[PDB]
Amino acid sequence: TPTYPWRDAETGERLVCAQCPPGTFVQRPCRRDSPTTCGPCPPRHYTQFWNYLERCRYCNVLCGEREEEARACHATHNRACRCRTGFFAHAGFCLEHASCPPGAGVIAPGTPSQNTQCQPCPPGTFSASSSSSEQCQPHRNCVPGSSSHDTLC
């Protein structure tokens, strides 16, 4: 259990007090005749580490219109956010995932942390669409199929 120094504001007298744990804060400091008293973080508050605060921290992260709560506000941690489905984080914004245009397909979709990833459809395959998910498909086995258009019968 980690500790902390404290002059009594009564006797000026040097004590070693003990720190409140996560989920709590100092509510009365230790004096000669007692140890520290810790209290519960009220609602919308938190402390996440061993601390000697006189009041709990405020859960001051709020989620954008394009984000959802990754963690929630809890007595032990601040709320945490991430890009909602269909978005990825970049420079503090939440951007829509790319679509790959026609003749391109998705080699990797967009996660919360990244964009869609596309390739030029390789020989023997095609993509008809602006799609953030549709991937390059092999032509049909019957005009020559392009990467954008299927082989025609």
Binding site: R44, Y58, N60, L62, L95
Partner: protein
């Protein structure tokens, strides 16, 4: 006890803006908050300030306006105390962010209601360290 306020951003769709006044970095001491407004209750000199942080994915240079203003009963019309406007502030199409800072001294009367107000409420970001509104009595 010094008459003082530091209000911080809060999520609503209203003009004027509305503010957090208890939690976190907020302060409110000897001054009242009512329906978005700080309500002066001792005629005097006060320094008054507001910062607001604007941001968007895609710059389109919508004009940004940031206003501190006053109302009371004594006359039926807003009086503007401080104001900034920004035009042609981002490169069109880009992610952008900028802030407006206003701060100055005013003689104010009891019963004066002060409010902040803004052009593009969608563009405003309401983090408590980024967007705020305050004063103190001298």
């Amino acid at each position: 006890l010094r008459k003082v306020a530091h209000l911080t951003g809060k999520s609503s769709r209203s003009m004027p803006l509305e503010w957090e006044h208890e939690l976190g970095l907020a302060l409110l001491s000897g001054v009242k908050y009512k329906k978005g407004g700080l309500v002066i209750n001792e005629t005097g000199l006060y320094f008054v300030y507001s910062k607001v942080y604007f941001r968007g994915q895609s710059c389109n240079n919508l004009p940004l306006s940031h206003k501190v203003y006053m109302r009371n009963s004594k006359y039926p019309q807003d009086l503007v105390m401080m104001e900034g406007k920004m035009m042609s502030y981002c490169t069109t199409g880009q992610m952008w962010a900028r802030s407006s800072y206003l701060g100055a001294v005013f003689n104010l009367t009891s019963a004066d209601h002060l409010y902040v107000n803004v052009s593009e409420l969608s563009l405003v970001n309401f983090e408590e360290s980024q967007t705020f509104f305050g004063l103190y009595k001298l």
